[PDB]
């Protein structure tokens, strides 16, 4: 691999400072669950900092199988953060999520009508929304997914939200569509050439923004450069057992996390955290 020297990785899509023409030419065990757990630990730990997580109910739509969620719940539980978890999915969840009084498992495909019923039952408690719903998917599938996610926000009115965000590819465009305002958080350990990110919103009332076909091209080119060039560098100045970019990226995400244990160095804290995550997910 190519070596490089960085002060920080790209955390949000806007920071990508170069593009590359997509080329059609296209590793870790349970990498999907690792990718989710990191982005959700990041998003939730940022809510912990703003003090809006304590006393909240996390509503996770499309959570099945959700093996990683058991690590989230344990993490904040051991931190003393009071959280209620409600995991709603058509498919069955990982049985590792069984027997937890603060985790409610719901087997159902959410529609507008049901979204109103869970809002009425949770109101006026703080709701935090996490959506990973997906119906390969077509641009029509994505458009329906993103329309449902919008309905999620307008009805559930969460204090904050994390939404699956992958723009349709320009050569599969259909129409302009709208998505919420938010920060486009990049995902370490995503599939080699995935252009998917997490749209993180903290609502002060939401505002929608139009996504055009020229935006689809910007996404394609920036994500390709990120996946082809950036994510294939070794950060030679980084002080860590593994210097590959994705670990550099993971490192910066993990240092926002809270810990009950005290460590002599930030590096020791990240190292302990990374091992704990990997051991639970069965990753060498
Ligand atoms: N309307 C809907 N309501 C609930 N779940 C939905 C849905 N549409 C799609 N899904 C779910 O979206 C999921 C996409 S994959 C989800 C992965 C999950 N976050 C994990 O932790 O492993 C599927 O499990 C599918 O059942």
From TrEMBL:
<feature type="binding site">
    <location>
        <position position="66"/>
    </location>
    <ligand>
        <name>S-adenosyl-L-methionine</name>
    </ligand>
</feature>
<feature type="binding site">
    <location>
        <position position="62"/>
    </location>
    <ligand>
        <name>S-adenosyl-L-methionine</name>
    </ligand>
</feature>
<feature type="binding site">
    <location>
        <position position="110"/>
    </location>
    <ligand>
        <name>S-adenosyl-L-methionine</name>
    </ligand>
</feature>
<keyword id="KW-0507">mRNA processing</keyword>
<keyword id="KW-0489">Methyltransferase</keyword>
<feature type="binding site">
    <location>
        <position position="132"/>
    </location>
    <ligand>
        <name>S-adenosyl-L-methionine</name>
    </ligand>
</feature>
<feature type="binding site">
    <location>
        <begin position="166"/>
        <end position="169"/>
    </location>
    <ligand>
        <name>mRNA</name>
    </ligand>
</feature>
<feature type="binding site">
    <location>
        <position position="91"/>
    </location>
    <ligand>
        <name>S-adenosyl-L-methionine</name>
    </ligand>
</feature>
<dbReference type="Pfam" id="PF01358">
    <property type="entry name" value="PARP_regulatory"/>
</dbReference>
<feature type="binding site">
    <location>
        <begin position="194"/>
        <end position="196"/>
    </location>
    <ligand>
        <name>mRNA</name>
    </ligand>
</feature>
<feature type="binding site">
    <location>
        <position position="22"/>
    </location>
    <ligand>
        <name>mRNA</name>
    </ligand>
</feature>
<dbReference type="InterPro" id="IPR029063">
    <property type="entry name" value="SAM-dependent_MTases_sf"/>
</dbReference>
<keyword id="KW-0946">Virion</keyword>
<feature type="binding site">
    <location>
        <position position="33"/>
    </location>
    <ligand>
        <name>S-adenosyl-L-methionine</name>
    </ligand>
</feature>
<keyword id="KW-0648">Protein biosynthesis</keyword>
<keyword id="KW-0808">Transferase</keyword>
<comment type="subunit">
    <text>Interacts with poly(A) polymerase catalytic subunit OPG063. Interacts with OPG109 and OPG123; these interactions might help linking transcription to capping and polyadenylation.</text>
</comment>
<dbReference type="InterPro" id="IPR030375">
    <property type="entry name" value="Poxvir_cap_MeTfrase"/>
</dbReference>
<dbReference type="GO" id="GO:0006370">
    <property type="term" value="P:7-methylguanosine mRNA capping"/>
</dbReference>
<dbReference type="GO" id="GO:0031440">
    <property type="term" value="P:regulation of mRNA 3'-end processing"/>
</dbReference>
<keyword id="KW-0251">Elongation factor</keyword>
<dbReference type="GO" id="GO:0032259">
    <property type="term" value="P:methylation"/>
</dbReference>
<feature type="binding site">
    <location>
        <position position="60"/>
    </location>
    <ligand>
        <name>S-adenosyl-L-methionine</name>
    </ligand>
</feature>
<feature type="binding site">
    <location>
        <position position="89"/>
    </location>
    <ligand>
        <name>S-adenosyl-L-methionine</name>
    </ligand>
</feature>
<dbReference type="InterPro" id="IPR025804">
    <property type="entry name" value="Pox/kineto_cap_MeTfrase"/>
</dbReference>
<feature type="binding site">
    <location>
        <position position="220"/>
    </location>
    <ligand>
        <name>mRNA</name>
    </ligand>
</feature>
<keyword id="KW-0506">mRNA capping</keyword>
<keyword id="KW-0949">S-adenosyl-L-methionine</keyword>
<feature type="active site" description="For methyltransferase activity">
    <location>
        <position position="164"/>
    </location>
</feature>
<protein>
    <recommendedName>
        <fullName>Cap-specific mRNA (nucleoside-2'-O-)-methyltransferase</fullName>
        <ecNumber>2.1.1.57</ecNumber>
    </recommendedName>
</protein>
<dbReference type="InterPro" id="IPR000176">
    <property type="entry name" value="mRNA_MeTrfase-like"/>
</dbReference>
<dbReference type="GO" id="GO:0044423">
    <property type="term" value="C:virion component"/>
</dbReference>
<dbReference type="GO" id="GO:0004483">
    <property type="term" value="F:methyltransferase cap1 activity"/>
</dbReference>
<feature type="binding site">
    <location>
        <position position="171"/>
    </location>
    <ligand>
        <name>mRNA</name>
    </ligand>
</feature>
<comment type="function">
    <text>Displays methyltransferase, positive regulation of the poly(A) polymerase and transcription elongation activities. Involved in the modification of both mRNA ends and in intermediate and late gene positive transcription elongation. At the mRNAs 5' end, methylates the ribose 2' OH group of the first transcribed nucleotide, thereby producing a 2'-O-methylpurine cap. At the 3' end, functions as a processivity factor which stimulates the activity of the viral poly(A) polymerase OPG063 that creates mRNA's poly(A) tail.</text>
</comment>
């Amino acid at each position: 691999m190519d070596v490089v020297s960085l002060d920080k990785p790209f955390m949000y899509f806007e920071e990508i400072d170069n593009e590359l023409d997509y080329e059609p030419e296209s590793k870790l065990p349970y990498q999907g669950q690792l990718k989710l757990l990191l982005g959700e630990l990041f998003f939730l730990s940022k809510l912990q900092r703003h003090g809006i997580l304590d006393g909240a109910t996390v509503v996770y739509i499309g959570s099945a199988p959700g093996t990683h969620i058991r690590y989230l719940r344990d993490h904040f539980y051991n931190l003393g953060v009071i959280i209620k978890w409600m995991l709603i999915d058509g498919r069955h969840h990982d049985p590792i999520l069984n027997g937890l009084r603060d985790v409610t498992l719901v087997t159902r495909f959410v529609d507008e009508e049901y979204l109103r019923s869970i809002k009425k039952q949770l109101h006026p408690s703080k709701i935090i929304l996490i959506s990973d719903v997906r119906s390969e998917p077509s641009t029509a599938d994505l458009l329906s997914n993103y329309a449902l996610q919008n309905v999620m926000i307008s009805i559930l009115n969460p204090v904050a939200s994390s939404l699956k965000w992958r723009c349709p590819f320009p050569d599969q465009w259909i129409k302009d569509f709208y998505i919420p305002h938010g920060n486009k958080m990049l995902q370490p350990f995503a599939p080699s050439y995935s252009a998917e990110m997490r749209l993180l919103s903290i609502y002060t009332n939401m505002r929608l923004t139009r996504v055009t076909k020229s935006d689809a091209v910007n996404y394609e080119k920036k994500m390709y450069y990120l996946n082809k060039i950036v994510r294939n560098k070794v950060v030679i100045n980084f002080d860590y057992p593994n210097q590959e970019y994705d670990y550099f990226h993971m490192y910066f995400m993990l240092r926002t996390v809270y810990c009950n244990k005290t460590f002599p160095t930030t590096k020791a804290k990240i190292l302990f955290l990374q091992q704990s995550i990997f051991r639970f997910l069965n990753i060498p």
